[PDB]
Design a protein around this ligand. Sequence first.
Ligand SMILES: Nc1ncnc2c1ncn2[C@@H]1O[C@H](COP(=O)(O)OP(=O)(O)OP(=O)(O)O)[C@@H](O)[C@H]1O
Ligand SMILES: Nc1ncnc2c1ncn2[C@@H]1O[C@H](COP(=O)(O)OP(=O)(O)OP(=O)(O)O)[C@@H](O)[C@H]1O
Ligand SMILES: [Mg+2]
Ligand SMILES: [Mg+2]
Lengths: 255, 252
Amino acid sequence: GVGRIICISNQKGGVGKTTTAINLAASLASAERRTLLVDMAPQGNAGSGLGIKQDNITGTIYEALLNDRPIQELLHPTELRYLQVVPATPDLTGAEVELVNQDNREFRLRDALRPLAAEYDYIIIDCPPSLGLLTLNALAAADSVLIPLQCEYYALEGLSQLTHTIDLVKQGLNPDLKMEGILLTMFDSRANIAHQVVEEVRGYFKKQVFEVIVPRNVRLSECPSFGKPIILYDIKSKGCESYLALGRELMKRDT
Amino acid sequence: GVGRIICISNQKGGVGKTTTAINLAASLASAERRTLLVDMAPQGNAGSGLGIKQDNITGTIYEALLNDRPIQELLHPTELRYLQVVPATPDLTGAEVELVNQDNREFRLRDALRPLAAEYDYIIIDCPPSLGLLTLNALAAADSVLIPLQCEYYALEGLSQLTHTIDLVKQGLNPDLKMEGILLTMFDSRANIAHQVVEEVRGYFKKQVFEVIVPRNVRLSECPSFGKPIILYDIKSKGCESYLALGRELMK
Ligand SMILES: Nc1ncnc2c1ncn2[C@@H]1O[C@H](COP(=O)(O)OP(=O)(O)OP(=O)(O)O)[C@@H](O)[C@H]1O
Ligand SMILES: Nc1ncnc2c1ncn2[C@@H]1O[C@H](COP(=O)(O)OP(=O)(O)OP(=O)(O)O)[C@@H](O)[C@H]1O
Ligand SMILES: [Mg+2]
Ligand SMILES: [Mg+2]
């Protein structure tokens, strides 16, 4: 009766982690899958893109990671009945430093999500652009990791270090961690490197790469400024189509 | 004759920090200003975009942060005589954990790097998308901070947290730290919000915002795959022109 915990990870900055976390979560919630979106990035963009931002640590994931507060007390409503959010704080930067000298440092999120595991169908964890303790808590809590891979050079160059870190995680912190898949993002057919990224990544990772590609689409960058996922901003747009298709692929794997 | 140390900082991921670091540095070096580019990001994109990439720690800034190695030993040549690089390692991820329990952890870069201003006109530090100990080292070492601001909503939303954190560094770690300027980047003139970001940022920060705006430009995203700054890849590109103009703006 337990749902699936998926972390959205890539230490390269600006590759579509949060756009993916928000729009995947909203797609699932629109299909009446109970979905929780947990923002583990100090920047707090997953919460902000859904109209949620907290003035201090109260009501944020920080309280569950360091202060033993039940995550049940930290659920925030959204415009979708089946989507709740646990938001971040910039104080998560300090939390990562505080956790270095604490016990069970990598399992704070894993342990905090236990009281909810069978209350949600999906728990989506948005990661910051880093491989530090916030991202490691996400990877240690997740059943699977979904890698958004921007179709540009620096993102491609960093993929090996990300998969190496996932392999290290499977050697101890979380042996059961599975690759949900690599999602090609921010694709632009006019850029010849974009085509090379698609070919190389599909060539090597094959069925670990999602069939759907997320195109560069200005509507995806507009909707967070209105605090809306793309399905509530411009449902016709190709970007919203891409994330609905991703949602359908994941829900197939749970039928 | 003492050079200027400029930190390129923005905790938002993917706003043009590295593209600015590389291409500002290469513009300055092309004008025969002695320039050193230090990569403080575990991703190591600043070095990679200039043809310098490695996984191991030897020769990287790791050794100056944790092993007391002089930065003078870590200088790597580029295709520009006046541009050297001190590269990163992915093991800076582990370094940032190790720094937590190090005496004077915030000043490791300052103590090792400030002396090199006697030998360089400009020292440019590329920061990772974070406000943790690597970025704080860069801010505590610098004379000034240059903020690249992508003309999209999340980057704008992050600006007040960034300036708040820079103020906190100024008050507690580096009282002389100055604003080099805000650089509007990745600007798409056909995007309504891009114009709104420009207008809001110029309205609040006024002349602290550079006149030059870096436009979205496909060649700027291509040249790192060849290990080349845009001045050595497509000098006929408006991306190249923007960063040459930025260099002229500073050199003034
Ligand atoms: N497919 C897309 N088309 C157009 N713009 C996009 C697309 N995906 C993301 N963006 C925009 O590009 C920027 C970077 O995306 P986003 O913030 O989701 O990346 P991220 O990996 O979460 O970044 P960070 O490393 O800061 O967490 C944002 O301003 C976002 O709105
Ligand atoms: N003006 C531009 N036009 C087009 N592409 C650009 C431009 N500036 C940067 N890019 C590309 O956008 C991506 C993000 O830029 P870049 O990596 O320089 O940002 P960053 O802030 O250094 O990222 P990170 O947070 O990961 O350090 C890269 O693939 C880069 O090549
Ligand atoms: Mg994000
Ligand atoms: Mg960078």
